[PDB]
Amino acid sequence: NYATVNDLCARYTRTRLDILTRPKTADGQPDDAVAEQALADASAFIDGYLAARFVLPLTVVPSLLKRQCCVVAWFYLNESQPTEQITATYRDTVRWLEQVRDGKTDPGVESRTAASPEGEDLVQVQSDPPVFSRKQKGFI
Amino acid sequence: NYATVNDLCARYTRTRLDILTRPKTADGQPDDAVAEQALADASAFIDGYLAARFVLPLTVVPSLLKRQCCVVAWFYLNESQPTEQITATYRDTVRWLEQVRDGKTDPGVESRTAASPEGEDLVQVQSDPPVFSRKQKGFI
Amino acid sequence: NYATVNDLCARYTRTRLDILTRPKTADGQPDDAVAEQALADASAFIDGYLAARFVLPLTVVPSLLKRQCCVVAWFYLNESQPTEQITATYRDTVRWLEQVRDGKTDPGVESRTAASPEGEDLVQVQSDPPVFSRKQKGFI
Amino acid sequence: NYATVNDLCARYTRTRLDILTRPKTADGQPDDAVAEQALADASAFIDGYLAARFVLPLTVVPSLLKRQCCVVAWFYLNESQPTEQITATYRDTVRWLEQVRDGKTDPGVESRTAASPEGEDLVQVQSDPPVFSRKQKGFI
Amino acid sequence: NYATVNDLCARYTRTRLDILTRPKTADGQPDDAVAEQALADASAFIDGYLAARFVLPLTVVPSLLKRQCCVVAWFYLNESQPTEQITATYRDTVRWLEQVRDGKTDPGVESRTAASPEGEDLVQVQSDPPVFSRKQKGFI
Amino acid sequence: NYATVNDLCARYTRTRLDILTRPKTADGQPDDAVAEQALADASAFIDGYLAARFVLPLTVVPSLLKRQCCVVAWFYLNESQPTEQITATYRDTVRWLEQVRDGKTDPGVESRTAASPEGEDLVQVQSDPPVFSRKQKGFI
Amino acid sequence: NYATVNDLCARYTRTRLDILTRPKTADGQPDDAVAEQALADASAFIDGYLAARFVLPLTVVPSLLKRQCCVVAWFYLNESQPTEQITATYRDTVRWLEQVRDGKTDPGVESRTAASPEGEDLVQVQSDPPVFSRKQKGFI
Amino acid sequence: NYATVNDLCARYTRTRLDILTRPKTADGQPDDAVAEQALADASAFIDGYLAARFVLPLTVVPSLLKRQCCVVAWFYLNESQPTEQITATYRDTVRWLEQVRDGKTDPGVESRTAASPEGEDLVQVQSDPPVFSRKQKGFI
Amino acid sequence: NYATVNDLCARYTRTRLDILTRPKTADGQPDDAVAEQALADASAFIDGYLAARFVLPLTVVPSLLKRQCCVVAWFYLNESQPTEQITATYRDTVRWLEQVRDGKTDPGVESRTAASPEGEDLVQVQSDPPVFSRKQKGFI
Amino acid sequence: RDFAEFLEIYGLPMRVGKYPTGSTNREKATLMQAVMDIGRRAGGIIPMGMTLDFQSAADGQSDPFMAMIGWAE
């Protein structure tokens, strides 16, 4: 997963996270595996939206992707009855992921070293070996 | 089915799942076969929406498909009177499946090893055997 | 019929099915032939919507078609006064059947073995026997 | 007629059918000829909507046409003051009949043997007898 | 007229027909000539809408035309203050007659023998006598 | 990060910042790391929106980017329940960042020395070495 | 900055400026650095909107830019809860700055001497040295 | 400035002008410099809107420009809470200034002598010196 | 000015004119210079709208221009709070002036002698002196 | 050699069929066997959702190749 539960419980108040999680567990006591599973599902969502033009086991993780995983995990964790703002922000992050997939916006870099994640060649052409090109310094 | 009942009862609270299931069974006591049948129907829905460009007995299962099966099973299990949010999320996942079938979005990978499911050749062309192509090193 | 009454009484609560059926019968006691007749009519509807590009005595039945027959039978069984959700879901399944007929979506497979139902050739062209084609290894 | 009164009184409750019919008769007692006349008018409606591309004394009757005749007969029998749902379903079946006449949807088959009703040639072209065609094995 | 008063008083309750007719007569007692005159006017309406592509003294009367005459007569007989449904059905039958005149829908047949009414040639072309056509077996 | 917490607590009142931050921390007492993390996420957002046409480890920081980071951090810090104005200003700054990325608006300069941040070549073309160009003073 | 705090406190009443500023400062007493920082941010905004077609360390400052900086500073200083008129005037001045950047409206002059600020060449073309032009008085 | 305060206090009642001005001054007593500063800002606005096609140190001042400066100064002086009519008239005068800048409407003349202000050449073309033109009375 | 105050006080009741004017004057007693100044501003407005295709020191004044000046002066004199009808009539006269400037409507004549005001040549073309034209009675 | 390869492709347009997405894996094989069955006087039926556009694969003429060949000879 892109973001750990210790970050989702920091961006979103831990008490509200416990309130959301405690029903979903089998026993009925505050649990941590539910949040990790939701974060894994959100990371899978982002991975699917990024694999279009990136090598998906990201060499360097864009620093905004932690936020983009936390928001989607929060929406996935409020599926029974979400606030209007949660839905609006989830639609905004889906729009951002669609723009990233299409090519309108790059995901960003790692804020530590400003390195952008690599990916496979979106465009690739092959032609026959070049003959009579200007690089052939013979003749002329 | 893509998702087991032990996952639908985790993403969605088991108590609410029992409330939804107990009428549908013949006896009137909480049952498990109803949830499995709904999950099978949702998996059939997803299979139909994915068979356009994939070999459907998926070699590797995309990790988001568990969520996409749970949501559709939950909607199929609330057919009598669903919440507005359940309907909205079902429409969102139908939109996502339509985008996957069209080609706008890839389903994702298996989060364990980042492997994408294979599929039949969407595009396939055949021409007559190549003669006088540049690969024929003779003549020249 | 695609779906049996034992499945319609499972997806939809049997008590509500008895409430819907008991007026339609001649005696006034809960009956089973009404549900089977409605399922047969819904299966006829689906058969008409699928015969465009399939051999209609389906060799393998798509697994979603059970759901698509149950929903249409339920709508046909609420013709006097249906809920808004029943009508909305019936419109959704009519839209899905129209998409299947047009070619936008394949019905799916049998979930047991992932086999797609066969059908007649949608496209078929005939030309005069090929002469001077590259397959004629003579001459050259 | 496509559907008998014993089927209209089964799809629609007989008591409501008697309530609708008892005023229309001359005496004032529940009658059966009114329902048969309405079914005949609905069958005439369907016959007019199907004669575009079918031999109208149908060799095999599509199995959905019983439903399509029952609904139109029910609407024709509620002409004084119909429910909104009756009008909506009548508009839906008129839309379906228009689609069948245009060619968008085939009526279906007989569910017993999966046989489609025959019809006259929608498209028919005549040319002069073929000469110099490839079928003339002479010359060459 | 296409439909007799004994049919208008059957499709529409005779008591309501008497209520509509008794003011229009001179004496003030239930009369029958008013209904026949309204039926004649409705038949004239239909005749005008059908004479576009039919020989108007119809050899065989389409079986739906009785319904189409009854509805228009009923609307013509409620000209002072009609129900919304009466107006809606009159608009529907005017739309159907317009479609018949344009050519979108054939009126139907006689349900007894499935015979369609004949009409004048909608399309008719004349050319000079054919010479050098393939039917001239001479020369060649 | 582009802006320090000592600037976010100046543009936005420190008391309100403490009110927003005190729940998110683990202990429950006013903390400073939450604000710095939100500022880092907002700076990552801006970095992703600027890396399209700039070398992202900015040599000189545009002076408006402090405001553009403070506003996005404030919105990110009100994710549970934001004011309408906060959302409107966040949409405005997202629009401004989109315009900067597209090329409609330059980010600005450093107000101290009016220096614009450098970036990679948006447009770059290569041709064969120039021969017979007017710069060849020979011949003529 | 384009405008000094002694001008913002004149166009906008000083008492209201103190009311807006006193919360933002650390101590809680009326401060002046907050207003200067807001004016600097507004001047950065205007500088970014003007650097498109001007040398940004303006040789002569347009006289309207003082107003355009005061309004943007006032809006930036009411970010928590602004009046509708403040937002409308901020949108108007953003529209004016967009028009200036596009080229629809020139910023103006210095009212003292009517001098317009200089800028870099928006349009610049280079061609080969002119030969055979009419300026070559030879030949002819 | 185009209009003096003695004209703004005549077109708009002096008492209301004092009411608008007395808060903005530092002391709190009716002042005159605020009105002159607002008039200077409005004159700068008009100067920017007129410099498109006029030499801005106007040789002769159009007589309507006094009104156009008074209205804009009044709007600039009601920035905290303006009447709807003040805003509407300000929009009207902005529209008029836009039309003047575009060329749709000339500003006018000086009413004393009907002289229009001069300006730089909007259109200017240069060609090579004319040879073989009809003005060359030689040859012919 | 086109219209005198003795005409504005006749078309519009003098008492209402005094009510509108008495605040604007310095003393507070009914004055006449305010009305003359408003009439001069309205005449400047009309002059600007007419100078497009007329020599502006009009040789003969169109007789409708008195009304068109009175209405604009009345609107200019109700700038604080105008009636809806005053605004509507001002918009109508602005539309008329725009039509006159564009060329859609001529202003009119002097009603005394039916003389239209002259103006500069809207269209003017120059060509080389005509040779070989039909007016050259030589040759032929 | 370039001229010969050009004649290998010239005067026979590429035959592409655009099957609607979601078509079964069996209906792509029949479509491809049909689009590769186009020969002399080929004529068939396609659903409304399918297209059979013909795109040229080699556009030009023989003048440049023969000019170069003549000059070299």
PDB file of N, CA and C in Angstrom, chain G residues 64-114:
ATOM      1  N   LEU G  64      -3.007  52.850 -12.140  1.00  0.00           N
ATOM      2  CA  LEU G  64      -4.112  52.005 -11.698  1.00  0.00           C
ATOM      3  C   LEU G  64      -3.634  50.800 -10.901  1.00  0.00           C
ATOM      4  N   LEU G  65      -2.360  50.432 -11.038  1.00  0.00           N
ATOM      5  CA  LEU G  65      -1.868  49.236 -10.369  1.00  0.00           C
ATOM      6  C   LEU G  65      -1.904  49.372  -8.856  1.00  0.00           C
ATOM      7  N   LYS G  66      -1.876  50.596  -8.328  1.00  0.00           N
ATOM      8  CA  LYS G  66      -2.063  50.769  -6.891  1.00  0.00           C
ATOM      9  C   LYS G  66      -3.444  50.285  -6.463  1.00  0.00           C
ATOM     10  N   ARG G  67      -4.480  50.681  -7.205  1.00  0.00           N
ATOM     11  CA  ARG G  67      -5.825  50.185  -6.934  1.00  0.00           C
ATOM     12  C   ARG G  67      -5.908  48.677  -7.123  1.00  0.00           C
ATOM     13  N   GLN G  68      -5.305  48.166  -8.200  1.00  0.00           N
ATOM     14  CA  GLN G  68      -5.368  46.735  -8.472  1.00  0.00           C
ATOM     15  C   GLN G  68      -4.611  45.912  -7.440  1.00  0.00           C
ATOM     16  N   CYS G  69      -3.630  46.505  -6.761  1.00  0.00           N
ATOM     17  CA  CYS G  69      -2.951  45.808  -5.680  1.00  0.00           C
ATOM     18  C   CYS G  69      -3.732  45.914  -4.380  1.00  0.00           C
ATOM     19  N   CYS G  70      -4.336  47.076  -4.122  1.00  0.00           N
ATOM     20  CA  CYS G  70      -5.132  47.235  -2.911  1.00  0.00           C
ATOM     21  C   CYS G  70      -6.319  46.282  -2.899  1.00  0.00           C
ATOM     22  N   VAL G  71      -7.005  46.131  -4.035  1.00  0.00           N
ATOM     23  CA  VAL G  71      -8.185  45.269  -4.051  1.00  0.00           C
ATOM     24  C   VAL G  71      -7.795  43.812  -3.820  1.00  0.00           C
ATOM     25  N   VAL G  72      -6.721  43.353  -4.465  1.00  0.00           N
ATOM     26  CA  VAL G  72      -6.309  41.964  -4.307  1.00  0.00           C
ATOM     27  C   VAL G  72      -5.792  41.717  -2.896  1.00  0.00           C
ATOM     28  N   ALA G  73      -5.091  42.692  -2.313  1.00  0.00           N
ATOM     29  CA  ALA G  73      -4.662  42.548  -0.927  1.00  0.00           C
ATOM     30  C   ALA G  73      -5.857  42.481   0.013  1.00  0.00           C
ATOM     31  N   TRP G  74      -6.880  43.301  -0.236  1.00  0.00           N
ATOM     32  CA  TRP G  74      -8.073  43.263   0.598  1.00  0.00           C
ATOM     33  C   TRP G  74      -8.769  41.915   0.502  1.00  0.00           C
ATOM     34  N   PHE G  75      -8.869  41.360  -0.709  1.00  0.00           N
ATOM     35  CA  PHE G  75      -9.470  40.037  -0.842  1.00  0.00           C
ATOM     36  C   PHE G  75      -8.629  38.973  -0.151  1.00  0.00           C
ATOM     37  N   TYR G  76      -7.306  39.031  -0.319  1.00  0.00           N
ATOM     38  CA  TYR G  76      -6.425  38.080   0.347  1.00  0.00           C
ATOM     39  C   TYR G  76      -6.508  38.199   1.857  1.00  0.00           C
ATOM     40  N   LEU G  77      -6.886  39.368   2.361  1.00  0.00           N
ATOM     41  CA  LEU G  77      -6.985  39.606   3.791  1.00  0.00           C
ATOM     42  C   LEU G  77      -8.362  39.267   4.350  1.00  0.00           C
ATOM     43  N   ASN G  78      -9.318  38.900   3.495  1.00  0.00           N
ATOM     44  CA  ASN G  78     -10.646  38.471   3.917  1.00  0.00           C
ATOM     45  C   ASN G  78     -10.910  37.018   3.540  1.00  0.00           C
ATOM     46  N   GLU G  79      -9.865  36.192   3.534  1.00  0.00           N
ATOM     47  CA  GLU G  79      -9.991  34.829   3.033  1.00  0.00           C
ATOM     48  C   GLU G  79     -10.879  33.953   3.908  1.00  0.00           C
ATOM     49  N   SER G  80     -11.043  34.290   5.188  1.00  0.00           N
ATOM     50  CA  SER G  80     -11.839  33.446   6.073  1.00  0.00           C
ATOM     51  C   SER G  80     -13.324  33.566   5.761  1.00  0.00           C
ATOM     52  N   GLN G  81     -13.818  34.790   5.611  1.00  0.00           N
ATOM     53  CA  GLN G  81     -15.235  35.035   5.349  1.00  0.00           C
ATOM     54  C   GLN G  81     -15.351  36.391   4.667  1.00  0.00           C
ATOM     55  N   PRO G  82     -15.374  36.422   3.339  1.00  0.00           N
ATOM     56  CA  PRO G  82     -15.468  37.692   2.620  1.00  0.00           C
ATOM     57  C   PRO G  82     -16.896  38.056   2.252  1.00  0.00           C
ATOM     58  N   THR G  83     -17.110  39.357   2.088  1.00  0.00           N
ATOM     59  CA  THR G  83     -18.373  39.846   1.567  1.00  0.00           C
ATOM     60  C   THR G  83     -18.510  39.445   0.100  1.00  0.00           C
ATOM     61  N   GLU G  84     -19.755  39.383  -0.373  1.00  0.00           N
ATOM     62  CA  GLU G  84     -19.989  39.069  -1.778  1.00  0.00           C
ATOM     63  C   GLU G  84     -19.371  40.122  -2.688  1.00  0.00           C
ATOM     64  N   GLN G  85     -19.421  41.390  -2.277  1.00  0.00           N
ATOM     65  CA  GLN G  85     -18.864  42.454  -3.105  1.00  0.00           C
ATOM     66  C   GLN G  85     -17.348  42.352  -3.199  1.00  0.00           C
ATOM     67  N   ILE G  86     -16.687  41.966  -2.108  1.00  0.00           N
ATOM     68  CA  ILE G  86     -15.238  41.791  -2.149  1.00  0.00           C
ATOM     69  C   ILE G  86     -14.868  40.717  -3.161  1.00  0.00           C
ATOM     70  N   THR G  87     -15.582  39.591  -3.133  1.00  0.00           N
ATOM     71  CA  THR G  87     -15.325  38.526  -4.095  1.00  0.00           C
ATOM     72  C   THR G  87     -15.607  38.988  -5.518  1.00  0.00           C
ATOM     73  N   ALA G  88     -16.697  39.732  -5.718  1.00  0.00           N
ATOM     74  CA  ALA G  88     -17.029  40.200  -7.061  1.00  0.00           C
ATOM     75  C   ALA G  88     -15.960  41.142  -7.599  1.00  0.00           C
ATOM     76  N   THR G  89     -15.474  42.058  -6.760  1.00  0.00           N
ATOM     77  CA  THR G  89     -14.438  42.983  -7.205  1.00  0.00           C
ATOM     78  C   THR G  89     -13.117  42.262  -7.438  1.00  0.00           C
ATOM     79  N   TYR G  90     -12.816  41.238  -6.637  1.00  0.00           N
ATOM     80  CA  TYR G  90     -11.619  40.447  -6.893  1.00  0.00           C
ATOM     81  C   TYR G  90     -11.723  39.708  -8.220  1.00  0.00           C
ATOM     82  N   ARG G  91     -12.895  39.153  -8.529  1.00  0.00           N
ATOM     83  CA  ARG G  91     -13.076  38.528  -9.834  1.00  0.00           C
ATOM     84  C   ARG G  91     -12.940  39.545 -10.956  1.00  0.00           C
ATOM     85  N   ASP G  92     -13.452  40.761 -10.753  1.00  0.00           N
ATOM     86  CA  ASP G  92     -13.312  41.799 -11.769  1.00  0.00           C
ATOM     87  C   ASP G  92     -11.849  42.160 -12.002  1.00  0.00           C
ATOM     88  N   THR G  93     -11.063  42.288 -10.931  1.00  0.00           N
ATOM     89  CA  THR G  93      -9.661  42.650 -11.122  1.00  0.00           C
ATOM     90  C   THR G  93      -8.851  41.487 -11.685  1.00  0.00           C
ATOM     91  N   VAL G  94      -9.224  40.244 -11.373  1.00  0.00           N
ATOM     92  CA  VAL G  94      -8.588  39.106 -12.032  1.00  0.00           C
ATOM     93  C   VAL G  94      -8.910  39.106 -13.519  1.00  0.00           C
ATOM     94  N   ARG G  95     -10.155  39.428 -13.872  1.00  0.00           N
ATOM     95  CA  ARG G  95     -10.517  39.537 -15.281  1.00  0.00           C
ATOM     96  C   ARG G  95      -9.710  40.630 -15.969  1.00  0.00           C
ATOM     97  N   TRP G  96      -9.538  41.771 -15.301  1.00  0.00           N
ATOM     98  CA  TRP G  96      -8.749  42.852 -15.883  1.00  0.00           C
ATOM     99  C   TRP G  96      -7.293  42.439 -16.067  1.00  0.00           C
ATOM    100  N   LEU G  97      -6.722  41.741 -15.083  1.00  0.00           N
ATOM    101  CA  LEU G  97      -5.340  41.287 -15.212  1.00  0.00           C
ATOM    102  C   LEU G  97      -5.199  40.258 -16.326  1.00  0.00           C
ATOM    103  N   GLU G  98      -6.188  39.378 -16.479  1.00  0.00           N
ATOM    104  CA  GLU G  98      -6.170  38.430 -17.588  1.00  0.00           C
ATOM    105  C   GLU G  98      -6.230  39.155 -18.923  1.00  0.00           C
ATOM    106  N   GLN G  99      -7.056  40.195 -19.015  1.00  0.00           N
ATOM    107  CA  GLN G  99      -7.127  40.970 -20.249  1.00  0.00           C
ATOM    108  C   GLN G  99      -5.806  41.675 -20.532  1.00  0.00           C
ATOM    109  N   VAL G 100      -5.144  42.179 -19.490  1.00  0.00           N
ATOM    110  CA  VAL G 100      -3.853  42.834 -19.679  1.00  0.00           C
ATOM    111  C   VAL G 100      -2.815  41.833 -20.169  1.00  0.00           C
ATOM    112  N   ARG G 101      -2.784  40.648 -19.556  1.00  0.00           N
ATOM    113  CA  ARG G 101      -1.824  39.628 -19.964  1.00  0.00           C
ATOM    114  C   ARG G 101      -2.078  39.167 -21.393  1.00  0.00           C
ATOM    115  N   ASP G 102      -3.347  38.962 -21.753  1.00  0.00           N
ATOM    116  CA  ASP G 102      -3.672  38.521 -23.105  1.00  0.00           C
ATOM    117  C   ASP G 102      -3.312  39.584 -24.133  1.00  0.00           C
ATOM    118  N   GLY G 103      -3.457  40.853 -23.768  1.00  0.00           N
ATOM    119  CA  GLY G 103      -3.247  41.956 -24.686  1.00  0.00           C
ATOM    120  C   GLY G 103      -4.492  42.762 -24.981  1.00  0.00           C
ATOM    121  N   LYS G 104      -5.627  42.450 -24.357  1.00  0.00           N
ATOM    122  CA  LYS G 104      -6.859  43.166 -24.663  1.00  0.00           C
ATOM    123  C   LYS G 104      -6.813  44.599 -24.149  1.00  0.00           C
ATOM    124  N   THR G 105      -6.152  44.829 -23.017  1.00  0.00           N
ATOM    125  CA  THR G 105      -6.096  46.149 -22.404  1.00  0.00           C
ATOM    126  C   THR G 105      -4.684  46.435 -21.918  1.00  0.00           C
ATOM    127  N   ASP G 106      -4.180  47.620 -22.232  1.00  0.00           N
ATOM    128  CA  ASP G 106      -2.905  48.040 -21.675  1.00  0.00           C
ATOM    129  C   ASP G 106      -3.091  48.499 -20.232  1.00  0.00           C
ATOM    130  N   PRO G 107      -2.091  48.291 -19.372  1.00  0.00           N
ATOM    131  CA  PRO G 107      -2.261  48.660 -17.958  1.00  0.00           C
ATOM    132  C   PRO G 107      -2.503  50.140 -17.748  1.00  0.00           C
ATOM    133  N   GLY G 108      -1.949  50.989 -18.603  1.00  0.00           N
ATOM    134  CA  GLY G 108      -2.063  52.417 -18.432  1.00  0.00           C
ATOM    135  C   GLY G 108      -0.697  53.059 -18.463  1.00  0.00           C
ATOM    136  N   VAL G 109      -0.578  54.199 -17.791  1.00  0.00           N
ATOM    137  CA  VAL G 109       0.656  54.967 -17.734  1.00  0.00           C
ATOM    138  C   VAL G 109       0.851  55.465 -16.309  1.00  0.00           C
ATOM    139  N   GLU G 110       1.971  56.144 -16.089  1.00  0.00           N
ATOM    140  CA  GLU G 110       2.142  56.954 -14.894  1.00  0.00           C
ATOM    141  C   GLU G 110       1.426  58.280 -15.112  1.00  0.00           C
ATOM    142  N   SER G 111       0.460  58.588 -14.244  1.00  0.00           N
ATOM    143  CA  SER G 111      -0.360  59.780 -14.426  1.00  0.00           C
ATOM    144  C   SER G 111       0.455  61.065 -14.383  1.00  0.00           C
ATOM    145  N   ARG G 112       1.649  61.034 -13.790  1.00  0.00           N
ATOM    146  CA  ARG G 112       2.465  62.239 -13.700  1.00  0.00           C
ATOM    147  C   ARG G 112       2.973  62.670 -15.070  1.00  0.00           C
ATOM    148  N   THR G 113       3.533  61.733 -15.837  1.00  0.00           N
ATOM    149  CA  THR G 113       4.187  62.062 -17.094  1.00  0.00           C
ATOM    150  C   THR G 113       3.658  61.280 -18.287  1.00  0.00           C
ATOM    151  N   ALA G 114       2.637  60.444 -18.102  1.00  0.00           N
ATOM    152  CA  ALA G 114       2.036  59.666 -19.185  1.00  0.00           C
ATOM    153  C   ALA G 114       3.085  58.830 -19.918  1.00  0.00           C
TER     154      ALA G 114
END
